[PDB]
Structures are given as C-alpha cells and as structure tokens.
C-alpha cells in the first residue's frame, strides 16, 4: 500500500506539465527509495529520467514495490484540478489497478479526491550507460529556454559548440542564420563551463523545446555533452530529486 504526502504539490503539477507533451504513457516505479520514472519519448529520440526521493516528501510510505502504468495525459488533466498551494497525496493499493490523488486546500474546508485508472504497459525498458562528459554547462534555465525558442525561428536544428572560453548555439534556414554565445562569468544568473575537450553536436530544437517545459522546476539547468553521445539536459528538483532529458544527436550520412 503506497502513500506519499507532498506539501509543495505544485511540484507534481510542474512535473507533469514537463512530461505530458513528450510522453503519452509512462510507468511510475514506486519503492521505499522514492518515485522514479524512465521512458523514451514517442519519437524514440530521447529518454526522460525522473527521480523523486522519499526524503523530499513530507510523509512517504511504500509497503509493496509498485509499477504504475500511468497515462500522463489523464494524470496531467487530473493534476490541473489542484491549486498551486494544495497538499497533494498519492495513495495506491498493491491490489487496486487505480491510483488516488487527494488534494487538500491549505484552509482545509475543501478536499478533492481523484481516483485515476491505471493500465498495463509493457513499456520498452532502456539502460543508460554511466559515462563521463567532455563539457558541462550550468546556466539559468530561463536563458536556456529563451535560446531554444530564439533559434527555433531560424532553423530546425541547433549546433552546440563548446570550447575553452564559452559555449555557442547556432542554426540556419530560409531566413538566414544566427548564433548565440555564452561565456563564463566571474548564483542562478551566472554561467559556468567545464571543458575537458572541445565538443560540437547537432540537436533538434523541437525536442530541446520540449525539455524546456521543465523550466519552472529550477532556476538553473546543466547541459552535459560529449563526442557522439546523447546530450544530457538536467533540471534539479530541490531536495526531491531531479528530471533528466537525454536527446540523441543528429549524425551525418
């Protein structure tokens, strides 16, 4: 019997708003460690890794290890019936094929209870190869988000070039081309760069733009690249865990 109490329920709301458009149906692994979710996107071009540690919850409790095939769209709709201040409570029954979302309004004169139908998903599981990265860029999430929105007007893909001094994003299309340059500074407004090896990779702005729906989850975001491997886009969820997006690069033929 699963039961978790999250006081800053807006966190859950923000999480689904960041997964729903990338993932239709996912599986939520529950355990004494905390909630976790890993799933390729529809397009099979990226992988999302969500980590919600039990510590972050104000009351966690997992008797039997659970695997809840959830429809992120239904869960998203349901979650929109929660105020950004309500206390949210996930609660499940090892025997019931349904998850329960109870929202308690601060005042407490109102309680919403939603029972969401689960489903059997035979999702295709993947294993991430723990590896090292040539470059790691930390920067405001809003800046990153804007960069991705800007270039999206120039072309479909973005070339991320990371050198010693700074990092560069660029694109081209019908209406010409452009590029943005970020250089290291000297908290959530600065840009730090860790370059062991200059790198250059091509990604689809379409997906980067999906990743950015997670912006309201953190002030900052870190980008981890390396020659010929998936770019890692990660947003920390303060004391709860995090949300990682892996995007496979575009290769030349």
């Amino acid at each position: 019997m699963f039961e978790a109490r999250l006081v800053q329920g807006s966190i859950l709301k923000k999480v689904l708003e960041a997964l729903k458009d990338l993932i239709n149906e996912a599986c939520w692994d529950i355990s004494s460690s905390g909630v976790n979710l890993q799933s390729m996107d529809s397009s099979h071009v990226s992988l999302v890794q969500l980590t919600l540690r039990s510590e972050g919850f104000d009351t966690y409790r997992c008797d039997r290890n659970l695997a809840m095939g959830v429809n992120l769209t239904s869960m998203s709709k349901i979650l929109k019936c929660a105020g950004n201040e309500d206390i949210i409570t996930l609660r499940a029954e090892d025997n019931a094929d349904t998850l329960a979302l109870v929202f308690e309004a601060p005042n407490q004169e109102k309680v919403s209870d939603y029972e969401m139908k689960l489903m059997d998903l035979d999702v295709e599981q993947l294993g991430i190869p723990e590896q090292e990265y040539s470059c790691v860029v930390k920067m405001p999430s809003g800046e990153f988000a804007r960069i991705c929105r800007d270039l999206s007007h120039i072309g479909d893909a973005v070339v991320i070039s990371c050198a010693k001094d700074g990092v560069k994003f660029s694109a081209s299309g019908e209406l010409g081309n452009g590029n943005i340059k970020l250089s290291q500074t000297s908290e959530e407004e600065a840009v730090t760069i860790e370059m062991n090896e200059p790198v250059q990779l091509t990604f689809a702005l379409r997906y980067l733009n999906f990743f950015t729906k997670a912006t309201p989850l953190s002030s900052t975001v870190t980008l981890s690249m390396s020659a010929d491997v998936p770019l890692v886009v990660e947003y920390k969820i303060a004391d709860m865990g995090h949300l990682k997006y892996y995007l496979a690069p575009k290769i030349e033929d």
Binding site: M40, S43, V45, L126, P129, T202, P230, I251, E252
Partner: peptide, 12 residues
C-alpha cells in the same frame, strides 16, 4: 548534422 538518430542506437 544531417540525420536524426534514435536513442536506441546509443543504448539498449
């Protein structure tokens, strides 16, 4: 920078 690759090809 020409063809989109799927994450499957980087890890299974």
């Amino acid at each position: 920078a020409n063809r989109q690759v799927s994450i499957t090809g980087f890890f299974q």
